């Protein structure tokens, strides 16, 4: 049992995930109880008025979803309330609370009524990113650090006493690390720092990548833009192992390539992905809509034989990278070697829940469980 282990498995959950077509659907009792430690629910968001506030009526509290997931407290789950997220981190309404102590104050109170409120465990924080709003270092000032910093104290200091979870979903990215985060501070105070090892790479960078690579590889661009160097450079700046999950996705990031004659890492690319059927999100496509693509519509898969990073996969002008069992056994293996706090997932509902592919139900979050759970390294 994962409960019984000296390991996390932070899952997260997605209201949006309901409305998809089919077999994408995704609701609360979809979620495998034996599969998580914690589930952490995205989204809730920054009202207009500096407080959190349920992000869709409809589904958080019409149809009760923050109940049926706080259900799985159930099972000796922690079921976590997750504030921001890359949408609501498009402008500058983290920064404004966060530089005011007065609207700090105010924001602090109503949020811990708001989890008692619900029965939630704890709170995560999600702002993508302190500083650096949606990863632009020259969008927000250096004060979001010492403020942020001075937020996750003040919630520190009402939850703690009422045995209540502080959390962060954390950049990978140095520049945004160096720039947003005192991780001394973090590092004390929160009980987990969820890092997000995933989005190193996407349609953005005009060229194919990897989304998730695990080790250098030597033709990148950078030495950094790896799980391993964003892992020790936590550690490096003052994270104790034991506070740090490692993020893994459950989904790949797509491209449609400039010339269907080369097919490689690195190539040009135009535009991100056709998007899929069920995620329709074009530069994404969960696990279950890749692994479809390979098994039933012919695309060739590339694997790295040193295992640095998870596979590649191609058909004509369409490209995607994403993380398989063997590349995850891999990552895992590597939580185990650093004597890491366990493990992190976005999100459920990407991973193939239906055995739409064969490998059986949730194929990718089965194999972190088992590994997690095999004593050897
Ligand atoms: C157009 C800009 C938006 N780009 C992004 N979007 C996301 S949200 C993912 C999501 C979630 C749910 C569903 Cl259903 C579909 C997709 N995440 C990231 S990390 C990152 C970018 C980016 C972009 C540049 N950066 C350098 C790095
Ligand atoms: C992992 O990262 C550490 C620290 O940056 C480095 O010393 C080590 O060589 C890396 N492992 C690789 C590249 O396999």
Redesign the pocket.
């Known amino acids: 049992s994962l409960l019984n282990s000296r390991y996390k498995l932070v899952c997260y959950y997605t209201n949006w995930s309901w409305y998809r077509p089919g077999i994408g659907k995704y609701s609360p009792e979809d979620i495998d109880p034996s599969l998580c430690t914690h589930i952490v629910y995205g989204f809730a968001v920054l009202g207009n008025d500096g407080l959190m506030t349920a992000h869709d009526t409809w589904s958080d509290y019409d149809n009760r979803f923050y109940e049926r997931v706080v259900e799985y407290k159930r099972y000796g789950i922690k079921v976590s309330l997750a504030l921001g997220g890359w949408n609501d981190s498009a402008g500058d309404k983290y920064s404004k609370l966060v530089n005011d102590p007065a609207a700090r104050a105010k924001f602090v109170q109503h949020a811990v009524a708001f989890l008692e409120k619900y029965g939630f465990d704890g709170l995560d924080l999600d702002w993508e990113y302190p500083k650096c709003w949606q990863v632009d270092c020259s969008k927000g000032p250096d004060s979001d650090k010492q403020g942020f910093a001075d937020l996750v104290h003040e919630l520190s200091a009402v939850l703690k006493p009422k045995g209540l979870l502080l959390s962060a979903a954390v950049s990978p990215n140095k520049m945004v690390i160096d720039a947003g985060y005192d991780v001394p501070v973090l590092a004390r105070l929160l009980d987990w720092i969820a890092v997000m090892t995933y989005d190193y790479h996407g349609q953005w960078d005009k060229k194919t990548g990897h989304v998730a690579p695990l080790?250098?590889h030597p033709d990148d661009d950078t030495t950094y833009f790896n799980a391993?160097?964003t892992i020790?450079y936590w550690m490096e700046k003052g994270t104790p192992a034991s506070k740090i999950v490692m993020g893994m996705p459950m989904y790949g990031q797509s491209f449609t390539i400039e010339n269907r004659g080369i097919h490689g890492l690195n190539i040009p690319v135009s535009d991100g992905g056709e998007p899929g059927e069920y995620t329709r999100a074009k530069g994404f496509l969960a696990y279950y809509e890749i692994c479809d693509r390979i098994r039933n519509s012919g695309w060739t898969v590339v694997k790295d034989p040193y295992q640095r990073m998870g596979p590649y996969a191609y058909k004509g002008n369409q490209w995607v990278s994403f993380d398989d069992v063997e590349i995850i056994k891999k990552k895992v293996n590597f939580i185990k070697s650093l004597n890491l706090g366990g493990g992190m997932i976005w999100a459920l509902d990407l991973d193939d829940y239906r055995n739409r592919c064969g490998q059986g139900k949730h194929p990718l979050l089965n194999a972190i469980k088992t590994e997690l759970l095999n004593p050897k390294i």
């Open positions: 080790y250098y391993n160097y020790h």
